[PDB]
């Protein structure tokens, strides 16, 4: 029912999901001069060498690449986190034009897309229990800007044809998520929420300062997907991003000065 259109888009979500107007909603604009450099923040630890990708799926709002999360094979720790967080899936948010598409913005600047690597706190046993906790998830957000091609993104781009419409899925094994990381792991961090319904306020956001660049032809392929299911009128999957929410009672911390 919810989507990104004029009739069921972000401005309407509060009717079915009242938490939409909550105290710790995401995304938010990152004001770099107001962000507090915090020296007690530990470096992030990304251990994705044993990652096992399984499937790619068009869910009607974005495409998700899913990972085997039955064991600690791809984890995130350190930074502002306590405990180990397992990678369960990653997905993107993009625009109809290169000047918009990201959910978070930096001093109001919008990027072409935003990658979200979603992890859940192992102390809670499964993803479903984790979303019910204030520290249940850790999402790593990476901005994409249009420039040179990202070689490690091509495997994802080539398979989009196969999952053009809502509900389609394809086997997607042996994909290494390390190919999507920028050089630097400097970041901003703040307490927030999922950016799509149910909008649960269970996320510790870790947004990387350095964007990765992808080519114009790579982002073009994303824009060829459909929100609709097979046999329905075609609605191109573009602009699946939620606009920035007020910061309210929160402080954004930076791991760098």
Annotated binding site for Zn(2+): 91, 93, 116
The residue from 12, 61, 104, 119 that is catalytic is 61
Q: Is 33 a catalytic residue?
A: no
Shortest Å, Cβ 203 to Zn ion: 10
Cβ distance to Zn ion smaller for residue 195 or 226: 195
Cβ distance to Zn ion smaller for residue 102 or 195: 195
Parallel/antiparallel/unpaired status of strands 85-94 and 63-67:
antiparallel
Shortest Å, Cβ 240 to Zn ion: 9
Cβ distance to Zn ion smaller for residue 94 or 172: 94
Query: Which positions make up the binding site?
Result: 91, 93, 116, 195-196
Closest CA to 255 of 19, 78, 28, 89: 78
Cβ distance to Zn ion smaller for residue 61 or 123: 61
Shortest Å, Cβ 116 to Zn ion: 4
H-assigned helices in 124-213 = 127-130, 154-158
Shortest Å, Cβ 82 to Zn ion: 23
Residue 27: asked if its preceding bond is cis (omega within 30°), the reply is: yes
Provide the terminal-to-terminal Cα distance of the chain, rounded to the nearest Å. Answer: 43
Closest CA to 221 of 165, 157, 143: 157
Report the distance separating Cα 68 and Cα 52, nearest Å: 5
Shortest Å, Cβ 117 to Zn ion: 10
Report the distance separating Cα 16 and Cα 151, nearest Å: 40
- How far from 196 is each of 2, 153, 241, CA to CA, in Å? 9, 24, 9
Cβ distance to Zn ion smaller for residue 86 or 93: 93
Q: What are phi and psi of 161, to 5 degrees?
A: -55, -40
Which residues form the interface with Zn ion (CB under 5 A)? 116, 195
Report the distance separating Cα 131 and Cα 140, nearest Å: 16
Query: Which positions make up the binding site for substrate?
Result: 195-196
For residue 212, the cross-strand partners are 144
Which residue, judged by CB position, is nearest to Zn ion in the bound state? 116
Q: How far does Cα 10 stand from its chain's mean position?
A: 16
Report the distance separating Cα 95 and Cα 28, nearest Å: 17
Catalogue the active-site residues. 61
């Amino acid at each position: 029912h919810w989507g990104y259109g004029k009739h069921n888009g972000p401005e309407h979500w509060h009717k079915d999901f009242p938490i939409a107007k909550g105290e710790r909603q995401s995304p938010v604009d990152i004001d770099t001069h107001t962000a507090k450099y915090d020296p007690s923040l530990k470096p992030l630890s990304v251990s994705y060498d044993q990652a096992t990708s399984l499937r790619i799926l068009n869910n009607g709002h974005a495409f998700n690449v899913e990972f085997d999360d039955s064991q600690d094979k791809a984890v995130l720790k350190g930074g502002p986190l306590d405990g180990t967080y397992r990678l369960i899936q990653f997905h993107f948010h993009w625009g109809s034009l290169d000047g918009q598409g990201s959910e978070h913005t930096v001093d109001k600047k919008k990027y072409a897309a935003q990658l979200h690597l979603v992890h859940w706190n192992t102390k809670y046993g499964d993803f479903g229990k984790a979303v019910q906790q204030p520290d249940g998830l850790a999402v790593l957000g990476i901005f994409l800007k249009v420039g040179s091609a990202k070689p490690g993104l091509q495997k994802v781009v080539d398979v989009l044809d196969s999952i053009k419409t809502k509900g389609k899925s394809a086997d997607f094994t042996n994909f290494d998520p390390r190919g999507l990381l920028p050089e630097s792991l400097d970041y901003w961090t703040y307490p927030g929420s999922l950016t799509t319904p149910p909008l649960l306020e269970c996320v510790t956001w870790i947004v990387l300062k350095e964007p990765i660049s992808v080519s114009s032809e790579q982002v073009l392929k994303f824009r060829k997907l459909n929100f609709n299911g097979e046999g329905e009128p075609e609605e191109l999957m573009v602009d699946n991003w939620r606009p920035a929410q007020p910061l309210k009672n929160r402080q954004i911390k930076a791991s760098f000065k």
